[PDB]
């Protein structure tokens, strides 16, 4: 097949995984010191689609308004994932408790998933791809990417 045929077929497979919301090969588990996390129940290969980071897609101005509201309740956690798409900044706000698993994945600077932007007809989606082979039973982890001194002081696990 031509490189272009391979790319089109591959894109269609990812679009179908995003559209269907199929979240196979994973389960919630309690992780020591981290609250809930997600563990692989099957073997993943490097480059395999893992899961969407799914929540409410909003623009940066609306995200800042929601941060002010969430800050009124210290019992509410941190699920806002900021990113650039073309010339604007957006946020996937996954604060609301749903059945989706991407929002339950914990942080590591030396994890096994990499976040990628995948657009479908001009709508951005944040997806997690395996950055290496993942053994069944491993906790899924990615780098949250927050290097702020204030964040690290309040959440020391961001250092590793």
């Amino acid at each position: 097949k031509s490189k272009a045929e391979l790319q089109s077929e591959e894109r269609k497979r990812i679009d179908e995984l995003i559209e269907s919301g199929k979240e196979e090969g994973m389960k919630i588990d309690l992780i020591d010191g981290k609250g809930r996390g997600v563990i692989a129940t099957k073997q993943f290969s490097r480059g395999d689609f893992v899961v969407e980071y799914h929540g409410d897609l909003i623009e940066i101005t609306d995200a800042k308004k929601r941060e002010a509201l969430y800050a009124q309740d210290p019992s509410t956690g941190c699920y806002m994932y900021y990113f650039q798409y073309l010339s604007k900044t957006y946020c996937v706000d996954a604060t609301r408790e749903t059945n989706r698993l991407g929002r339950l994945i914990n942080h590591s600077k030396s994890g096994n998933c990499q976040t990628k932007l995948h657009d479908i007809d001009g709508v951005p989606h944040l997806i997690l791809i395996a950055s290496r082979d993942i053994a069944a039973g491993e906790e899924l982890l990615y780098d949250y990417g927050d290097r702020s001194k204030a964040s690290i002081e309040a959440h020391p696990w961001l250092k590793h």
């Binding site: 941190c78 994932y81 900021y82 949250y144 002081e153």
Partner: peptide, 8 residues
């Protein structure tokens, strides 16, 4: 104090 997640 809240942290964020950022796609760098």
């Amino acid at each position: 104090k809240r942290h964020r997640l950022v796609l760098r």
